[PDB]
Write a protein that binds this ligand. Sequence first.
Ligand SMILES: OC[C@H]1O[C@H](O[C@H]2O[C@H](CO)[C@@H](O)[C@H](O)[C@H]2O)[C@H](O)[C@@H](O)[C@@H]1O
Length: 404
Amino acid sequence: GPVIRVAGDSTAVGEGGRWMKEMVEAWGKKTGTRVEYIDSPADTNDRLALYQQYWAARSPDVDVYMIDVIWPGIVAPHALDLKPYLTEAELKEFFPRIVQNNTIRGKLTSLPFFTDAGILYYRKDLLEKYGYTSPPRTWNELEQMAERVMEGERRAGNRDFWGFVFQGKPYEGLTCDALEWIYSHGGGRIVEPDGTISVNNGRAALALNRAHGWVGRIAPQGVTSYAEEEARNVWQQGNSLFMRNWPYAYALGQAEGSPIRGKFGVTVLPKASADAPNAATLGGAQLMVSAYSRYPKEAVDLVKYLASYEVQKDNAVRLSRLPTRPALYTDRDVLARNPWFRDLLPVFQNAVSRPSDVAGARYNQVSEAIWTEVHSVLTGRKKGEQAVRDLEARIRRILRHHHH
Ligand SMILES: OC[C@H]1O[C@H](O[C@H]2O[C@H](CO)[C@@H](O)[C@H](O)[C@H]2O)[C@H](O)[C@@H](O)[C@@H]1O
């Protein structure tokens, strides 16, 4: 019979790739269909380049791809339109914002699978030890807490201890972290939904200078090479007061044998002042059937299974990843395991999107400009003022003649 072949997620990021393979195997067992799992590199931008090789070749060797929230405008020609395969009722079981995201020129490129939002992880034990009762609400507070706790922990002998870890590597994750910094300083969305390239402003430049100020001070010098997992490893070993990361890190930190089990909470990222907007970058994954799959019926059946209530529930319960079905945020077992899903649901609902809608198929070029210019600030090569001026000019060149 057919072999249905899936590329999606990575065994190099938490449990995602292992779990995905498990879920695909479970569908194959349930339906009596042969399946195969193709692994991917850790970073989303590397995965895009890999999958583009298959798409350029019109390759039938992958039937289902997991695609990033930022990808529908890029990948649409390589996607089978799913609209004819779902009833309106079935589609309404997902968040409408994400279905809209996934719909390009009327083509439903992909089903919503899990969503994602940047959050603050904090060591509750350490906040209590140093006389703090609440996590920080402002970036200045975060810096003050970090300096005090670091001084104390270093003095106590932990030479591995830092105040803050985040994703500073030059890749798509830095675009995510930098949108949060800029937006939380009142600096805008980098490129607004209407097309205005807004980043050349003093608030954005301040946000980037502030982040530079962390490097080698409250954050390790090596933070300029950290993706999700590098940050998570320092944090999970017990060596950081604070971390910015996605929801997946929570279940991993609570696993038996984690040095930090029971010692942490999560909250919204800080912001520059009380009237700035909360910032949590929208992330997450969708499920696409390849336009090149020889087995579209079967592939669609697999994608409906993966996006189903019970598989999303398993993802929430075991991997602390966020459902794309509003019903699951009221499910007793999801909430018992992850009470913070209820506390931070409004943060997830108000997550700020990267400019993938407005940049469309040029989004990856825009993002590479963002992360390279931002990285130049983190490394001390450019000041934020120059970087945002230079980034404005780059993005203007990239998007010249593009209309959404
Ligand atoms: O949260 C678990 C996921 O982390 C990565 O994906 C997030 O971070 C990317 C940037 O590095 C974003 O583009 C993406 O939207 C986020 O969901 C990782 O790539 C995923 O495999 C993990 O599931």
